[PDB]
Amino acid sequence: PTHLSVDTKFKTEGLCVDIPGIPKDMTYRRLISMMGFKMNYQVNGYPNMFITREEAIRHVRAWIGFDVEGCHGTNLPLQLGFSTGVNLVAVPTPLMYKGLPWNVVRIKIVQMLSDTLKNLSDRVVFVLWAHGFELTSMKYFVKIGPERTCCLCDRRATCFSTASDTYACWHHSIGFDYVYNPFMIDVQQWGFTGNLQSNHDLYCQVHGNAHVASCDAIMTRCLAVHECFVKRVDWTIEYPIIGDELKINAACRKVQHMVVKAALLADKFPVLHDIGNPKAIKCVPQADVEWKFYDAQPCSDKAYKIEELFYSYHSDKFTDGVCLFWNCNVDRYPANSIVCRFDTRVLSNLNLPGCDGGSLYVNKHAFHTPAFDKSAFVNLKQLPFFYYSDSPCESHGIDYVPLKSATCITRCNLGGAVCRHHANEYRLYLDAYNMMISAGFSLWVYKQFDTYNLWNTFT
Ligand SMILES: CC1CCN(C(=O)c2cc3ccccc3o2)CC1
Ligand SMILES: [Zn+2]
Ligand SMILES: [Zn+2]
Ligand SMILES: [Zn+2]
């Protein structure tokens, strides 16, 4: 039960308008053969062009929605649409390109996939809502065979060049003309009633239908993301490290401790209501405060309604003390809150386009996050940068330029000049802070929060 068997059945009903007379009885083995490919009884790591839903979920970073719409099959020009928003027109002699022959179209395809995927995945997974032309056009830009490595590096080959007879990964494919050993999944095989637009529109209002192939390619990948990450959630699937994952997670832990410690010192709340992670630990273990935990898993569809989290009869009084919502996305935060909210609009290799304005944030695990909404924070203000420390001014053990900063809240800065230890610690914390902010996180705090109240914690 590793890969999808080629002898598995393929429902051909969705294919019979572009392919009239298609047999109802059909396997992946026969379909691949009909697509013009020959698998030659090869036991070399590529057992099937098509993959299982479980394999697609593990390779979500590789997903590229793909759709082909006939402008006028062998005689008529095709419109190739991709979930990148690209539309290429191929002649057989929302970015719209004029009609060009396949020999130049395939070059643009390799360029586009390589630029989109090089920092995301070792492969491409073509996400389809298959009607016929997308499958029968694959032979014009795809070559298959045994699993290979890049000519210039150790990564698996994802491209082929007919000019040099060589193979390359997404990083070394400049001037390559064929997509090598791609993967694909037909969403129509999952059991749906009705056309793509009707099933997509049940869950998403952000993607519209202009009737161009890229629009359908976008709706397909969106529907696939809703099915695999919004309605069905799996926090047991690990994902490889492709960027600053560890540094961002470490920075997040440092910022949480810093912000929560300072709020408890500035406003001395008697109780803290920690809403979120059922496996959460006190971020400030030495604080005097009464720490009360409330379990809520990450919401992947719509943000939690504060009325359902707090009401229906716990301290009961959430109005007492402070509330901490560290990645616990709610519709409107109460005024007495400390909040970390991920901004779904952020551009990064970790954040993939999602469903209904939301985004698929992939960092060790995949978390579909509801659309960032500025109105959730009307009772709060943006938390400004500050570094706070009550640790002794003692260096122990990198060089030095004297630090001067109004936001270095330490005994040394209070007393006039920042010590070397607190200057090192301040710069490291500011680096972690910028990492976390640029990863897409946003910090919000109750309006009375004032760092001026921290200077008196040194007396
Ligand atoms: C897009 C965000 C990125 C950071 N996330 C978490 O670190 C996380 C883990 C967890 C477990 C339970 C409740 C909330 C939780 O947030 C997921 C959300
Ligand atoms: Zn390479
Ligand atoms: Zn959508
Ligand atoms: Zn100091």
mmCIF file with all atom_site columns, N, CA and C in Angstrom, residues 95 98 173 182 193 202 314 413 445:
data_model
loop_
_atom_site.group_PDB
_atom_site.id
_atom_site.type_symbol
_atom_site.label_atom_id
_atom_site.label_alt_id
_atom_site.label_comp_id
_atom_site.label_asym_id
_atom_site.label_entity_id
_atom_site.label_seq_id
_atom_site.pdbx_PDB_ins_code
_atom_site.Cartn_x
_atom_site.Cartn_y
_atom_site.Cartn_z
_atom_site.occupancy
_atom_site.B_iso_or_equiv
_atom_site.pdbx_formal_charge
_atom_site.auth_seq_id
_atom_site.auth_comp_id
_atom_site.auth_asym_id
_atom_site.auth_atom_id
_atom_site.pdbx_PDB_model_num
ATOM 1  N N  . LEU A 1 95  ? -2.642  35.870 -16.767 1.00 0.00 ? 95  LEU A N  1
ATOM 2  C CA . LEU A 1 95  ? -1.675  36.318 -17.772 1.00 0.00 ? 95  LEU A CA 1
ATOM 3  C C  . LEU A 1 95  ? -1.915  35.557 -19.073 1.00 0.00 ? 95  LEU A C  1
ATOM 4  N N  . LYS A 1 98  ? -0.262  34.871 -26.520 1.00 0.00 ? 98  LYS A N  1
ATOM 5  C CA . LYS A 1 98  ? -0.740  34.485 -27.856 1.00 0.00 ? 98  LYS A CA 1
ATOM 6  C C  . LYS A 1 98  ? -0.247  33.096 -28.301 1.00 0.00 ? 98  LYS A C  1
ATOM 7  N N  . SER A 1 173 ? 17.800  23.727 -14.401 1.00 0.00 ? 173 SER A N  1
ATOM 8  C CA . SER A 1 173 ? 17.100  23.446 -15.634 1.00 0.00 ? 173 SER A CA 1
ATOM 9  C C  . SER A 1 173 ? 17.025  24.560 -16.662 1.00 0.00 ? 173 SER A C  1
ATOM 10 N N  . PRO A 1 182 ? 6.831   13.814 -13.999 1.00 0.00 ? 182 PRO A N  1
ATOM 11 C CA . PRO A 1 182 ? 5.925   14.560 -13.127 1.00 0.00 ? 182 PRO A CA 1
ATOM 12 C C  . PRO A 1 182 ? 4.897   13.631 -12.485 1.00 0.00 ? 182 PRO A C  1
ATOM 13 N N  . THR A 1 193 ? -20.412 15.328 -7.099  1.00 0.00 ? 193 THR A N  1
ATOM 14 C CA . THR A 1 193 ? -21.624 15.499 -7.883  1.00 0.00 ? 193 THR A CA 1
ATOM 15 C C  . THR A 1 193 ? -21.550 16.907 -8.460  1.00 0.00 ? 193 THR A C  1
ATOM 16 N N  . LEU A 1 202 ? -19.051 26.164 -3.298  1.00 0.00 ? 202 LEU A N  1
ATOM 17 C CA . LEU A 1 202 ? -19.648 25.777 -2.018  1.00 0.00 ? 202 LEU A CA 1
ATOM 18 C C  . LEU A 1 202 ? -18.760 26.240 -0.837  1.00 0.00 ? 202 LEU A C  1
ATOM 19 N N  . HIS A 1 314 ? -12.906 26.348 34.484  1.00 0.00 ? 314 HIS A N  1
ATOM 20 C CA . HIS A 1 314 ? -12.774 27.715 33.980  1.00 0.00 ? 314 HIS A CA 1
ATOM 21 C C  . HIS A 1 314 ? -12.978 28.718 35.079  1.00 0.00 ? 314 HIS A C  1
ATOM 22 N N  . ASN A 1 413 ? 20.558  50.411 30.833  1.00 0.00 ? 413 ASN A N  1
ATOM 23 C CA . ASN A 1 413 ? 20.009  51.515 30.041  1.00 0.00 ? 413 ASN A CA 1
ATOM 24 C C  . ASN A 1 413 ? 19.303  52.555 30.929  1.00 0.00 ? 413 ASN A C  1
ATOM 25 N N  . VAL A 1 445 ? -1.821  43.785 21.320  1.00 0.00 ? 445 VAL A N  1
ATOM 26 C CA . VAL A 1 445 ? -1.911  43.841 22.774  1.00 0.00 ? 445 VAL A CA 1
ATOM 27 C C  . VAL A 1 445 ? -3.032  44.798 23.224  1.00 0.00 ? 445 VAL A C  1
#
